[PDB]
């Protein structure tokens, strides 16, 4: 069984769903944690300084 | 009793296991009556088929030379 096209058949799982807090399809319903806003992990909002070029 | 091993395994496999299996599927003495009705129930567990005295004993041999030393003192 090749790692390409045939392994793409077993892909009927739901992981990332529409978040309650921000609304991006980043709420990992198995982890109950958002990968975009960080809902379920932090009380604060997931923002990072590297999401923009250093001097901007 | 190790005839299920076939042409595989070896001599010590069909001498030891076959000996200790023909020895346990046998008739042994019971401490609650005095009859030969002692059968096995698993690993270490021994059972009588009379007044069903479910007792303890050596894994495959009912009475080990170490389990008979408890009687001397």
């Amino acid at each position: 069984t090749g790692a390409g096209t045939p392994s793409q058949g077993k892909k009927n799982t739901t992981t990332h769903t529409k978040c309650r807090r921000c609304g991006e399809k980043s709420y990992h319903t198995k982890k109950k944690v958002c990968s975009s806003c960080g809902f379920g992990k932090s009380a604060k909002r997931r923002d990072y300084e590297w999401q923009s070029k250093a001097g901007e | 009793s190790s005839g299920r091993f076939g042409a595989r395994y070896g001599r010590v496999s069909r001498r030891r296991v076959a000996e200790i299996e023909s020895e346990m599927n046998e008739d042994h003495a019971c401490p609650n009556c005095g009859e030969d009705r002692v059968d096995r129930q698993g690993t270490g567990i021994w059972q009588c088929s009379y007044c069903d005295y479910k007792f303890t004993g050596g894994s495959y041999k009912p009475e080990t030379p170490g389990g008979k030393t408890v009687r001397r003192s």
């Binding site: 739901t14 769903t17 529409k18 399809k25 | -």
Partner: protein, 46 residues
Amino acid sequence: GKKSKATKKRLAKLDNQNSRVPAWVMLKTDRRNHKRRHWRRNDTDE
């Protein structure tokens, strides 16, 4: 797949977003839907 109540409310709106720009908007602006979605070629949320 079993959908919930909210999931239904959402998929419902997405279907109304699939309606064309009415004939009169063309006559009012004196002459394109960009959120044009197909059930096969496109992907929705969840």
